[PDB]
From a paper:
Human mitochondrial gene expression relies on the specific recognition and aminoacylation of mitochondrial tRNAs (mtRNAs) by nuclear-encoded mitochondrial aminoacyl-tRNA synthetases (mt-aaRSs). Here, we present cryo-EM structures of the human mitochondrial seryl-tRNA synthetase (mSerRS) in complex with mtRNASer(GCU). The mtRNASer(GCU) is highly degenerated, having lost the entire D-arm, tertiary core, and stable L-shaped fold that define canonical tRNAs. Instead, mtRNASer(GCU) evolved unique structural innovations, including a radically altered T-arm topology that serves as critical identity determinant in an unusual shape-selective readout mechanism by mSerRS.
To understand the molecular basis for tRNA-recognition in human mitochondria, we first determined the high-resolution crystal structure of human mSerRS bound to 5’-O-[N-(L-seryl)sulfamoyl] adenosine (SerSA), a non-hydrolysable analog of the seryl-adenylate intermediate. Appended to each catalytic domain is an N-terminal domain, which forms a long coiled-coil ‘helical arm’ of two antiparallel α-helices that protrudes away from the synthetase core. Both active sites are occupied by a SerSA molecule, bound similar to previously described SerRS structures.
Author numbering:
A (entry chain A): 39 to 125, 128 to 334, 338 to 506
B (entry chain B): 39 to 124, 129 to 335, 339 to 506
The structure:
């Protein structure tokens, strides 16, 4: 049921126990409670007091067990000398008393050991839900409180009232989201011709730009075990799960990934990277699956999406980690400006930061048909939260293994970008202007009506 | 559950009942039984007569159902006629009403028996295979026929070394300590290996686009019936189809080819004659369970594959020409990568349920020391069209069942193995084939600047 896979991995010896910075949080209790409330996370300040109590009791049981073991191991050596040194083997009641002391402590330990396991499991489960710290400049509050740091571009001015992405696509037969209920499901999309080329072009353009800027290219397994998701700070256990799961009966611990952050993290799990290699910048393109059951219609929310992701393992300094975030943001902003898109960079507030994020920058791009700015990219400094759980480490020249910092950002979310590109570059005739960067991949300056005859329904449902 | 989703679609009224070629089986039961046996599929000669018998019981029961129904209408009309001419008093009137009640009760009992027979005939019928080209060889994979052999085995001063060793040395592939992270037969490709996959897909896609293939993007999560339509069995006990938790989500299954999605696009929809032949190219992340049906990238659960699919004109020759066109494109791609490959006509046992003809290409992989399948090309004829209602409209306007052909343009895992093993060098470097040089950016893959990751884990003692 509600079991931390990471603790279970420690239990079977698969992985070590997650390390936590609980002592620092305990050192300032009033400050700690205030921080959590700002997060408005599942564990708000109300759930906090019980964890402190669980932690305190756990320490004591260990103390007792430690003392008992020292006494228990000691007596055996002492008796060994007595039988040989006495040279009437068991007559001295001291010999008799010593055996008795061992048995009573052994009995006490046999009772004590199960209680230690139950408590260790309990404290870790509550700790697993403990949120990351918040950067001082982070705006505090709901999405509305989020700050707008930089705005680039001007809203496209249209003579006509602009049409929506799906309408333009279906008219050009480049997007199909219709008659797909009994084949692929609700919110499922097929991209045809230019739409497919547009995705391929956007992914290839972003991949090439990042590869040139020193990103190391990688391919990630798309089916991954749940412990990794918990390590990335994603919640596999929760009821409104966005994570699709392979049938447990058929296969165990296999969960589809909604990003490549999870996969890239898996590569670094339980492994160390040399300080000299750091910083580590990596780029991956993956098919991403997210349930998102939690109601609009269109490509804005969909179950399957192809996304190019930027990930990095950075050095010890929190300041060193923050630099990567700004670099990632700069690149994110550059790709969008190069695509001719109007966008605004928002420092995210505590309520939207999420459990693993010290600071998050999200970029909203103007979509004319929606008439709204919508997240097209997310950038987050996860600091050591992910490193501590999955054991991503950096080894210094000295030989020391120390926890590393993880930064994650989105280069290309094909679904939303198509909406921005199609709606913004729309023309009254219904033609869409291929932005200059992608013109090479697409092969044209305008997406024009197709030569082909579109599919027509031959099903019984037609009325 | 154990239901054939296709029948349920008809039951729920979502789609029409699958049409089928069982009539040919009934016409020549002996000939069909010999053909079914040569296939060695789920069904067997002995199974066919029961299917033939089940058809007889169903059709006869339906004919009786119509006969009684005709009578019930006759009585109602005669009763209405008596009512117009004029009541309960009339002696025959009461008789007619009672006869009507009797026919109604008899129909009510007969109705369910027909439905049970329909499901039984259909579920066994859908396990019935497509026909085979006469040229198709008969027997196991041992009895394959080699249509063509291109290239020559690479010459090596050193003993050839395997892809996994070459990969780990250059840190382009990882299959180590992934058990608690992604599973066995799971792999991570890094640097040049990622570039090689990106290049192979982009190279293959580009050639196809230039030859006029239409680009497509297929939803990875698909409902089960489409798999059944393509001739794949999700209900099988040793299923190679990964299923999302049924309790959590309904009928969402992962795809092992894009064949399924592309078929869905054409399902229960019609194409115009002018468009034919319709050629589409898709790139898909393909997932396959493969429950023992050893290591390395030869058999893996996640793979990237570019698939050529086409819906052709009415003639079988129209389908066959596309198959040869598809193999031709496949052979060219392999050659342009400087690979030694053999084209094999697959025998009946290996054809598969929806296959009229299958041509597969095996490539020379030196470290293994054996040839290996990299491509499958097949003509499914009308088997898929009949099941998923993929149809074309003639100039007059008749809607008729189409023919579908499927072929693997590029399968990244096995091809990476051969290019790496075949183009290997003693220094441990691997030479980038000229076509892929632009994408990789180098003529040879050499040792990496970075330091390989080191396990900090507990399992080490
Ligand atoms: N259900 C969805 N439908 C469409 N696009 C989505 C969906 N979920 C996420 N995305 C896209 O993915 C972008 C980033 O996703 S995110 O979850 O916010 N953040 C991440 O994924 C980070 N792990 C880095 O990629 C969103 O801006 C949006 O562009
Ligand atoms: N488990 C696997 N591991 C690695 N490669 C695989 C695996 N399954 C299939 N492939 C690759 O995909 C190619 C085609 O596979 S196939 O099942 O024969 N044919 C199909 O996939 C058809 N659906 C057409 O694509 C194989 O030759 C091989 O190159």
């Amino acid at each position: 049921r509600n079991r931390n896979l990471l603790y279970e991995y420690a239990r079977e010896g698969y992985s070590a126990l997650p390390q936590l910075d609980i002592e620092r949080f305990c050192a300032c209790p009033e400050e700690a409670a205030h921080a959590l409330e700002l997060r408005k996370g599942e564990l708000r300040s109300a759930d906090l007091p019980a964890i402190i109590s669980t932690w305190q009791e756990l320490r004591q049981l260990q103390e007792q067990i430690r003392s008992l073991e020292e006494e228990k191991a000691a007596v055996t050596e002492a008796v060994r000398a007595l039988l040989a040194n006495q040279d009437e083997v068991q007559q001295d009641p001291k010999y008799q008393g010593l055996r008795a002391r061992g048995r009573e402590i052994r009995k006490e330990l046999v009772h004590l050991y199960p209680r230690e396991a139950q408590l260790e499991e309990q404290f870790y489960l509550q700790a697993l839900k403990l949120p990351n710290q918040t950067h001082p400049d982070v705006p505090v509050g709901d999405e509305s409180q989020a700050r707008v740091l930089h705005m680039v571009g001007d809203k496209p001015v249209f003579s006509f009232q602009p049409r929506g992405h799906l309408e333009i696509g279906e008219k050009l037969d480049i997007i199909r989201q219709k008659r797909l209920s009994h084949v692929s499901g609700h919110r499922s999309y097929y991209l045809r011709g230019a739409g497919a080329l547009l995705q391929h072009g956007l992914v290839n353009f972003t991949f090439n730009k990042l590869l040139r800027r020193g990103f190391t290219p990688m391919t990630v397994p798309d089916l991954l075990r749940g412990a990794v998701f918990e390590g990335c700070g994603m919640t596999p256990n929760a009821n409104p799960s966005q994570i699709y799961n392979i049938d447990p009966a058929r296969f165990k611990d296999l969960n589809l990934a909604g990003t490549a952050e999870v996969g890239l993290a898996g590569y670094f799990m339980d492994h160390t990277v040399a300080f000299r290699d750091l910083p580590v910048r990596m780029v991956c393109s993956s098919t991403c699956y997210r349930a998102e059951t939690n109601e609009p219609r269109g490509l804005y929310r969909v179950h399957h999406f192809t996304k190019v992701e930027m990930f990095g393992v950075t050095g010890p300094g929190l300041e060193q980690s923050s630099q990567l975030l700004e670099e990632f943001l700069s690149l994110q902003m550059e790709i969008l400006t190069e695509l001719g898109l109007h966008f605004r960079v928002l420092d995210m507030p505590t309520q939207e930061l999420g459990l693993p994020a010290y600071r998050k920058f999200d970029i909203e791009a103007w979509m004319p048909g929606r008439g709204r700015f919508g997240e097209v990219t997310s950038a987050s400094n996860c600091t050591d939260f992910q490193s501590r759980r999955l054991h991503i480490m950096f080894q210094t020249e000295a030989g020391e293994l120390q926890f590393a910092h993880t930064v994650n950002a989105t280069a290309c979310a094909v679904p939303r970008l198509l909406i921005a590109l199609l709606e913004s570059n729309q023309q009254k005739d219904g033609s869409v202007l291929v932005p200059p960067a992608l013109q090479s991949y697409l092969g044209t300056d305008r997406i024009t009506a197709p030569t082909h005859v579109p599919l027509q329904y031959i099903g019984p449902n037609q009325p």
